[PDB]
Design a binder for this molecule. Structure first.
Ligand SMILES: [Zn+2]
Ligand SMILES: [Zn+2]
Ligand SMILES: [Zn+2]
Ligand SMILES: [Zn+2]
Lengths: 120, 25
């Protein structure tokens, strides 16, 4: 929904789960499950292999979702030296550097964390 | 909270790339 998300083209999806090597026809429980695919690299995974809740799955499927390694901070659009400590929203899975949150964070939030776009 | 680092660990490792290639072939 962000302007810079409506604007970056989407890479061709790979129709194989990077984690279990199944397709949309077979996840780890040998049942069909649609894949989610990274908009930048095209790699895909079952939501069940990504450990996404059903609610989070619905939301990321409607967004320009990025995999763990491709994730860029939604504020500064960078990864940078602090990329490994980038927070992932538990509602939309967007990434934010702690220093790029509104308000900026000095310490890691405890428990489930929802980003500045998602909180009412 | 979830970070890139902790998500990498909690999710579990990806399958071997060579096996992902023999699948896609
Ligand atoms: Zn899978
Ligand atoms: Zn990616
Ligand atoms: Zn940032
Ligand atoms: Zn969010």
């Amino acid at each position: 929904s962000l302007p810079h998300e409506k604007d970056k083209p989407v890479a061709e999806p790979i129709p194989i789960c990077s984690f279990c090597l199944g397709t949309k026809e077979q996840n780890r429980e040998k049942k069909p499950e649609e894949l989610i695919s990274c908009a930048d690299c095209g790699n895909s995974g079952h939501p069940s292999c990504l450990k996404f809740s059903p609610e989070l799955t619905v939301r990321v499927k409607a967004l320009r979702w990025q995999c763990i390694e491709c994730k860029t901070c939604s504020s500064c659009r960078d990864q940078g030296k602090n990329a490994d400590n980038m927070l992932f929203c538990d509602s939309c899975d967007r990434g934010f550097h702690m220093e790029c949150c509104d308000p900026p964070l000095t310490r890691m939030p405890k428990g489930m964390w929802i980003c500045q776009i998602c909180r009412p | 909270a979830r970070t890139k680092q902790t998500a990498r660990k909690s999710t579990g490792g990806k399958a071997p790339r060579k096996q992902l290639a023999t699948k896609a072939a």
